[PDB]
Design an enzyme around this catalytic site. Structure first.
Site, PDB file in Angstrom:
ATOM      1  N   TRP A   1      27.517 -19.050 -22.754  1.00  0.00           N
ATOM      2  CA  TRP A   1      27.468 -18.551 -21.388  1.00  0.00           C
ATOM      3  C   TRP A   1      26.071 -18.669 -20.798  1.00  0.00           C
ATOM      4  O   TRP A   1      25.914 -19.094 -19.656  1.00  0.00           O
ATOM      5  CB  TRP A   1      27.937 -17.092 -21.316  1.00  0.00           C
ATOM      6  CG  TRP A   1      29.414 -16.973 -21.199  1.00  0.00           C
ATOM      7  CD1 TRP A   1      30.330 -17.036 -22.213  1.00  0.00           C
ATOM      8  CD2 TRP A   1      30.166 -16.890 -19.983  1.00  0.00           C
ATOM      9  NE1 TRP A   1      31.607 -17.009 -21.701  1.00  0.00           N
ATOM     10  CE2 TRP A   1      31.536 -16.920 -20.335  1.00  0.00           C
ATOM     11  CE3 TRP A   1      29.815 -16.799 -18.625  1.00  0.00           C
ATOM     12  CZ2 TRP A   1      32.558 -16.863 -19.378  1.00  0.00           C
ATOM     13  CZ3 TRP A   1      30.831 -16.743 -17.675  1.00  0.00           C
ATOM     14  CH2 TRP A   1      32.187 -16.776 -18.058  1.00  0.00           C
TER      15      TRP A   1
ATOM     16  N   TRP B   1      24.790 -26.715 -33.456  1.00  0.00           N
ATOM     17  CA  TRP B   1      24.780 -25.847 -32.283  1.00  0.00           C
ATOM     18  C   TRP B   1      25.232 -24.437 -32.646  1.00  0.00           C
ATOM     19  O   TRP B   1      24.755 -23.456 -32.069  1.00  0.00           O
ATOM     20  CB  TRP B   1      25.678 -26.395 -31.176  1.00  0.00           C
ATOM     21  CG  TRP B   1      24.935 -27.259 -30.242  1.00  0.00           C
ATOM     22  CD1 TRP B   1      24.828 -28.620 -30.287  1.00  0.00           C
ATOM     23  CD2 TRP B   1      24.104 -26.825 -29.163  1.00  0.00           C
ATOM     24  NE1 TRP B   1      23.976 -29.059 -29.304  1.00  0.00           N
ATOM     25  CE2 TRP B   1      23.515 -27.979 -28.598  1.00  0.00           C
ATOM     26  CE3 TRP B   1      23.795 -25.569 -28.618  1.00  0.00           C
ATOM     27  CZ2 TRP B   1      22.632 -27.919 -27.515  1.00  0.00           C
ATOM     28  CZ3 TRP B   1      22.916 -25.507 -27.541  1.00  0.00           C
ATOM     29  CH2 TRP B   1      22.345 -26.678 -27.001  1.00  0.00           C
TER      30      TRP B   1
ATOM     31  N   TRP C   1      27.580 -12.121 -15.515  1.00  0.00           N
ATOM     32  CA  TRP C   1      27.906 -12.745 -16.794  1.00  0.00           C
ATOM     33  C   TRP C   1      28.286 -11.757 -17.896  1.00  0.00           C
ATOM     34  O   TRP C   1      29.193 -12.030 -18.681  1.00  0.00           O
ATOM     35  CB  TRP C   1      26.738 -13.619 -17.276  1.00  0.00           C
ATOM     36  CG  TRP C   1      25.473 -12.865 -17.522  1.00  0.00           C
ATOM     37  CD1 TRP C   1      24.592 -12.413 -16.584  1.00  0.00           C
ATOM     38  CD2 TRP C   1      24.960 -12.441 -18.791  1.00  0.00           C
ATOM     39  NE1 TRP C   1      23.560 -11.730 -17.189  1.00  0.00           N
ATOM     40  CE2 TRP C   1      23.762 -11.732 -18.543  1.00  0.00           C
ATOM     41  CE3 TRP C   1      25.397 -12.588 -20.113  1.00  0.00           C
ATOM     42  CZ2 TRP C   1      22.995 -11.171 -19.570  1.00  0.00           C
ATOM     43  CZ3 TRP C   1      24.635 -12.027 -21.135  1.00  0.00           C
ATOM     44  CH2 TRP C   1      23.447 -11.327 -20.855  1.00  0.00           C
TER      45      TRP C   1
END
Ligand code: FAD
Ligand code: TDR
Length: 415
Positions: A350, A246, A327
């Site tokens: 995010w 990841w 954000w």
């Protein structure tokens, strides 16, 4: 003349291609440049960096080698060190970040000798031809970890220069250095790896390795870590390595979609009605939303500089969906409070937890602040340590109406 080995986000001696590439050709002298573009950040992150640089020097010294530390702009300091040492060439690990490329081009221009860049160790390269927005197809390319390069046993002697400033982190820092990082890896692999699959979701994140702060500064190579875990094998190893992937997926994304640092991967959210209310931002930023979970998460973050993955996705989504706070501002403030704060990784985190386009994660998935807390925390011991006030994960005077805020988002999202 010696060869200069320029360390950036790779403060280690183990599995370091640039170090061995130079050592094989002749005597080397290491170098770290304290760059204002990286050091002008929050105290906790600056200190974490400095302390790991101090640890690298000790590692060089212990082997009889020399590590220079200079302060200033890389395009002025690297050539300076090269001139002073009469170095034949400079070796470093390639950097595919916007700043990394800009910086290295400038250095190459100022340098009178060759600058040799070698690929940094990865499980999967970020500059892979095909561009994937989804994790599964990306992860299928992984065929196991290649062997890591060994650290040098001893280093040639050379002159040492420069001093390493001391900063007040304003909090307790993990033990700095490669030795500490390596011991942590061993422990995790011998004790926690076996049950990792069943313990990787706890809110207190004690089922994890807690090695992210080291990975962030290259104190630990991901290739070495994966290779070690794969030697153990099992379900635990498979799942843990998948997490390491990841990280690489994060760099892959930012590399192919630079613009995602500016706008959502998913175009249909390029114009979401982000309500920038300074009042709500502080509430979230300070952990005063009234929601036990988010509050305890933000409080641990401010105090420790670390937060489990489960905690991060909640706190992050809550702000994006339940408060519609933009954000861009939230992700920046988040990164600055993290010891493992990594631009690419934090951004994908995010844009994923925020349902903004990563891994095609659906917007309709909305965390339930109380359920999450009861399904991922036993006697609420976690909540007890960070938010003693709250009796349970029961919203005791929320800064907004959860059920409403939810339907509010879901509504807006459907456009
Ligand atoms: C909103 C959000 C922001 C995040 N920002 C960061 C950040 O700035 N820096 C950072 O290092 N991590 C970030 N993460 C990813 C993640 O939460 C951590 O890497 C993890 O909590 C580290 O704990 P650990 O070292 O015990 O991980 P372990 O579970 O032991 O995993 C081992 C390693 O794999 C990598 N890893 C694990 N999970 C992820 C993941 N989801 N994405 C990418 N890499 C992963 C990390 O390097 C980690 O140290 C973020 C996640 C979210 C949801
Ligand atoms: C991107 C991502 C996926 N899955 C997680 O559990 N955490 C993350 O940050």
């Amino acid at each position: 003349g010696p060869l200069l080995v320029w360390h950036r986000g790779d403060l280690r001696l183990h599995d370091h291609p640039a170090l061995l590439e130079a050592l094989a050709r002749g005597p080397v002298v290491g170098l770290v440049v304290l760059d204002p573009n990286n050091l002008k950040t929050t105290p906790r992150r600056r200190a974490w960096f400095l302390e790991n640089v101090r640890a690298l020097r000790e590692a060089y010294r212990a082997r009889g080698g020399a590590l220079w530390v200079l302060e200033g702009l890389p395009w002025e300091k690297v050539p300076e060190a090269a001139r002073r040492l009469k170095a034949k060439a400079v070796y470093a690990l390639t950097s595919h970040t916007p700043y990394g490329r800009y910086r290295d081009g400038r250095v190459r221009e100022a340098l009178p000798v060759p600058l040799h860049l070698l690929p940094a160790p990865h499980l999967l390269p970020p500059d892979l031809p095909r561009a994937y927005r989804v994790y599964t197809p990306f992860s299928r390319l992984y065929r196991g970890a290649a062997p890591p390069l060994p650290p040098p046993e001893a280093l040639p002697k050379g002159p040492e220069e420069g001093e390493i400033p001391r900063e007040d982190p304003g909090l307790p820092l993990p033990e700095p250095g490669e030795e500490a990082a390596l011991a942590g890896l061993r422990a995790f692999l011998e004790a926690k790896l076996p049950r990792y699959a069943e313990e990787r979701d706890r809110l207190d994140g004690e089922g994890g390795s807690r090695l992210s702060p080291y990975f962030a500064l290259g104190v630990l190579s991901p290739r070495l870590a994966a290779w070690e875990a794969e030697r153990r094998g099992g379900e635990g190893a498979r799942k843990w390595v998948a997490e390491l992937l990841w990280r690489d997926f994060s760099y892959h994304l930012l590399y192919h979609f630079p613009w995602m640092a500016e706008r959502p991967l998913d175009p249909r959210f390029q114009a979401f009605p982000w309500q920038e209310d300074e009042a709500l931002f502080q509430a979230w930023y300070e952990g005063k939303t009234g929601v036990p979970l988010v509050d305890a998460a933000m409080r641990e973050l401010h105090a420790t500089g670390f937060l489990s993955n489960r905690a991060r996705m909640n706190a992050a989504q809550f702000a994006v969906k339940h408060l519609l706070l933009p954000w861009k501002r939230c992700e920046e403030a988040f990164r600055h409070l993290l010891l493992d704060g990594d631009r690419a990784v934090n951004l994908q985190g995010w844009q994923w937890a925020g349902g903004l386009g990563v891994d095609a994660a659906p917007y309709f998935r909305v965390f339930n602040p109380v359920l999450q807390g009861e399904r991922h925390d036993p006697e609420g011991r976690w909540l007890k340590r960070w938010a003693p006030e709250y009796p349970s994960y029961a919203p005791k005077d929320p800064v907004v109406d959860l059920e409403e805020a939810r339907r509010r988002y879901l509504r807006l999202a459907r456009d």
